[PDB]
Amino acid sequence: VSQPIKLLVGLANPGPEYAKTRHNAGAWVVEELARIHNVTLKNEPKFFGLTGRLLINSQELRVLIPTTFMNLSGKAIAALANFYQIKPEEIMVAHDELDLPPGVAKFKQGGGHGGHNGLKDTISKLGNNKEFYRLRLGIGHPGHKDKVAGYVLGKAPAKEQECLDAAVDESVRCLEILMKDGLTKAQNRLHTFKAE
């Protein structure tokens, strides 16, 4: 009934060529939630991104997909959160997670950026504050660390993308439960999900 989230951010690189790359996994969640709740995101240059507002279980949720470079995502998040009086702890940032496999997603409060450019910039622009929530969308990882950038800026193969899309769908269902039943119940459900 009570839950801490006022702003959901889906991290992304802008433009059609990057739309289905792994590094946009967070945006897929916001895109799907907005589609299901009939909200049209508006390009607001003041917030360096696409924005919207929806009501879920009588709770107001703002959404944001930045149009910055991924490594400047914090500009958009800070601009919007500061305008609407939203604290870091009331923000949930959905992002691709190298440390989880395709088909899995997890909620997390706080933590490091894990080398994610978007998360690193968000921490900085929020005043070196790590304590925002994350929705970690597993994308798996390459064999060698020097190939990570090429991997996340790549498109998953079709079967792998099926797994990703299944986790995006369950993530969206659990964000709905978050707003209705709260964080613990949302997390309990999400963390038992594995796409097969």
- CA atoms of 68 and 125, how far apart (whole Å): 13
DSSP state, 46? G
Closest listed residue to residue 148, CA positions, set 159, 140, 137, 136 = 140
Q: How many CB atoms lie within 10 A of CB 82?
A: 13
133 is in an annotated binding site: no
CA angle 79, 84, 86 (to 5 degrees): 90
Which residues are 138's β-sheet partners? Answer: 97
Q: What are phi and psi of 92, to 5 degrees?
A: -120, 125
CA 7 to chain centre: 10
Is residue 8 within 8 Å of 88, Cβ to Cβ?
no
Is 69 annotated as belonging to a binding site? Answer: yes
**Structure tokens belonging to residue 92:** 């949930």
Q: Was 71 annotated as part of a binding site?
A: yes
Give the residue from 14, 36, 23 showing the smallest Cα distance to 152.
Answer: 23
- Burial-class residue 196 by CB neighbours within 10 Å (0-12, 13-18, 19+): exposed
Residues serving a catalytic function are 23
Residue 117 near residue 72 (C-beta atoms within 8 A): no
94: left (phi over 0), alpha (psi -120 to 50) or beta: beta
Known binder of ligand: residue 129?
A: no
Task: Identify the burial level of 115 via C-beta atoms within 10 angstroms of its C-beta, where 0-12 means exposed, 13-18 middle and 19 or more buried.
Answer: exposed
Ordered structural domains, the chain, with CATH = 1-196 (3.40.50.1470)
